Amino acid sequence: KPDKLVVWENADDGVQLNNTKKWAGEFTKKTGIQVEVVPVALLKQQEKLTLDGPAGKGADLVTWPHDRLGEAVTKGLLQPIQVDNSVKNQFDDVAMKALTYGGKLYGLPKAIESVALIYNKKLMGQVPATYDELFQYAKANNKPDEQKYGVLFEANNFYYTYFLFAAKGAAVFKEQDGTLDPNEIGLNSPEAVQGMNEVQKWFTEARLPQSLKADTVNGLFKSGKVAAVINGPWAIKDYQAAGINVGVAPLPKIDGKDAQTFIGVKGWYLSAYSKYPKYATELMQFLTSKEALASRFKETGEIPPQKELLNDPMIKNNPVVNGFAKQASKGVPMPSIPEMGVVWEPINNAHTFVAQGKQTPEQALNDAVKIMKEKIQTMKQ
């Protein structure tokens, strides 16, 4: 009786891995079914499954941002799921839509997420009311030489800097009753140039360091040297373990207008190569029940897009959640079409080149989209 179920979970050597290990053990306690939980980096799971899945060595359950759903559907990595109407009903509509591709549902949500303004309460009293003032605050307080900042964030990552292309009226793809068009990339429009002009000023005026990464942003904030970062819910537990008195506010309004961040839904998905699609959907349900997502929030800090859980005033008005949820409500879901995968590397290289003073915002952007359009073809044929 060789009966095992395999789950791939983010390799955080901590809170996200642990929670899924716990609830997968309870399922093993309840059903007798052996459920192994392999830690695989959130962003490395899709490529691993591309190799392992068709070789019978893949996981049954996998997870990554809804960002890359569609490419996975197109590449035969995932199969749709069938769950009861009552189960389907327990989840946030925005979350469930982000997990739906070509009319079909590919997963159950674990987390609804957006970046917000997270601040060290002993360095920042009240949050700057506007973006202009948040910026002037960075201009005045940032000092790379002493490694102390008023504002630090991944200003070389398009996932972070997007509220800022969006403020200018720039989009990733064209608006044909949605995000329906792969062939009309808006990332080299005049409004996109203005957005990159704003990214540039973060390295030019606000003097953010070149070669930034999440480790640099987190480490400096944790060592108490940064007043405020732009980061997401996933970082809170880590900050609080380092003992920061974290406050969470929405992003200060920009141009007298709501900041428009990306919205990310992290889901469990069913591998198209799972030999046990029925029993794995059962597992996926067990992992996303109200009781499991209650415990996940408390352990990971990651906001579950479960309707009854979002309802609770102890979760809705929690100061460490409130700001994220409000900002999330002002956001747009990341596009989920197959050709979104093409965007990340070019546009982020374009950020590095501008930040570095190697290429102008106009040339960096024009180069980026030409590369993007070229890659749309490698997908085809």
Ligand SMILES: OC[C@H]1O[C@@H]2O[C@H]3[C@H](O)[C@@H](O)[C@@H](O[C@H]4[C@H](O)[C@@H](O)[C@@H](O[C@H]5[C@H](O)[C@@H](O)[C@@H](O[C@H]6[C@H](O)[C@@H](O)[C@@H](O[C@H]7[C@H](O)[C@@H](O)[C@@H](O[C@H]8[C@H](O)[C@@H](O)[C@@H](O[C@H]9[C@H](O)[C@@H](O)[C@@H](O[C@H]1[C@H](O)[C@H]2O)O[C@@H]9CO)O[C@@H]8CO)O[C@@H]7CO)O[C@@H]6CO)O[C@@H]5CO)O[C@@H]4CO)O[C@@H]3CO
């Ligand atoms: O960074 C070092 C890693 O290098 C190597 O990884 C490379 C990849 O192999 C390569 O493919 C490429 O990545 C591309 C990627 O595959 C594409 O998906 C895409 O990515 C975009 C994505 O699709 C969008 O959704 C968005 O991402 C945002 C995301 O939605 C949002 O959730 C958030 O992510 C946060 C996490 O949710 C949160 O958990 C936390 O992450 C922690 C992590 O939990 C913890 O374990 C630790 O991570 C380790 C990691 O486990 C190690 O594996 C190692 O990573 C290297 C890889 O192994 C290499 O293969 O070290 C990590 C230490 O940093 O720490 C994390 C930090 O706290 O926070 C996350 C945010 O910080 O935000 C993301 C935005 O960042 O946008 C994505 C694009 O920006 O495009 C990718 C690029 O083309 O390149 C990889 C980099 O070398």
